[PDB]
C-alpha cells in the first residue's frame, strides 16, 4: 500500500509499505529515497511522535495516510529564550554549543547582532566563549535575552 510523508520544506515523499512495517522500516525507506539517516527523522501522525519499534498498524495508519516528517539533530535538545518583549523563542541546540553559537541562532529569529545580545541564566550574564554544557544548561532550560541598545 502507499503512504505519503510530508516534509516542512513542502515536499511530499511517496512510500510503498505494508501495515506490518515498523516505524524503523519506514524511516529506512525515507533514507533510501532522500538520504536522511533514520536517527535524524521524527515522524508524526495523529499528533504523536511515532516510536521505532511500533508498526503502522499499531498506530492505525491506513493506506494513503499522510505522515509528517521533522528533522532533528541526533544529539540535539531544545531551550527557550525569553525576551523582555515576552516573545519566547524555541531553539534547537546541543550541549557543545557556545553562547556565541546560541546568539547566532537568535540573530536568525530576532535580527539582532550577537554583540548586541546579552543572555542571562540563573541570575548570571553568560559569557560568549563557554558552552551550554559548561553552564549545566539542560533540555527545556529558559534563558533570558536582553538587548544592548545604543545611546
Amino acid at each position: 500500500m502507499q503512504i505519503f510523508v510530508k516534509t516542512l520544506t513542502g515536499k511530499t515523499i511517496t512510500l510503498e509499505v505494508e501495515p506490518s512495517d515498523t516505524i524503523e522500516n519506514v524511516k529506512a525507506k525515507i533514507q533510501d529515497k532522500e538520504g536522511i539517516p533514520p536517527d535524524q527523522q521524527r515522524l508524526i501522525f495523529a499528533g504523536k511522535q511515532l516510536e521505532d519499534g511500533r508498526t503502522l498498524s499499531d498506530y492505525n495508519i491506513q493506506k494513503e495516510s499522510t505522515l509528517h516528517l521533522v528533522l532533528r539533530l541526533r544529539g540535539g535538545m531544545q531551550i527557550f529564550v525569553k525576551t523582555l518583549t515576552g516573545k519566547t523563542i524555541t531553539l534547537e541546540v546541543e550541549p557543545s554549543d557556545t553562547i556565541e553559537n546560541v546568539k547566532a541562532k537568535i540573530q536568525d529569529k530576532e535580527g539582532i547582532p550577537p554583540d548586541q545580545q546579552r543572555l542571562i541564566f540563573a541570575g548570571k550574564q553568560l559569557e560568549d566563549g563557554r558552552t551550554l554544557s559548561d553552564y549545566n544548561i539542560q533540555k527545556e532550560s529558559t534563558l533570558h535575552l536582553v538587548l544592548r541598545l545604543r545611546g
Binding site: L8, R42, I44, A46, G47, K48, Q49, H68, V70, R72, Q78, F80, K87, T88, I89, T90, L91, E92, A122, G123, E140, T142
Partner: protein
C-alpha cells in the same frame, strides 16, 4: 489521544504550557488558551516550578 496545542507547522500536539513546538520549534499559537483544568505531568510540572523558583529570587 494527545492533549494540548497542535503545532500548525508539523501537526505535533504539544503540552498546553510549552511555549514552542517540541518537534519543530514553532511558537505556540497566540490564540490557544491553556486550560485552567490542565494537570501537567511531573516533568512539565517540575519545569514550571523551576521557572516559578527563578522569579522569587
Amino acid at each position: 489521544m494527545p492533549v494540548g496545542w497542535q503545532c500548525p507547522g508539523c501537526t505535533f500536539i504539544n503540552k498546553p504550557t510549552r511555549p514552542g513546538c517540541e518537534m519543530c520549534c514553532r511558537a505556540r499559537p497566540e490564540t490557544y488558551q491553556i486550560p485552567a483544568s490542565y494537570q501537567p505531568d511531573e516533568e512539565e510540572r517540575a519545569r514550571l516550578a523551576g521557572e516559578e523558583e527563578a522569579l522569587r529570587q
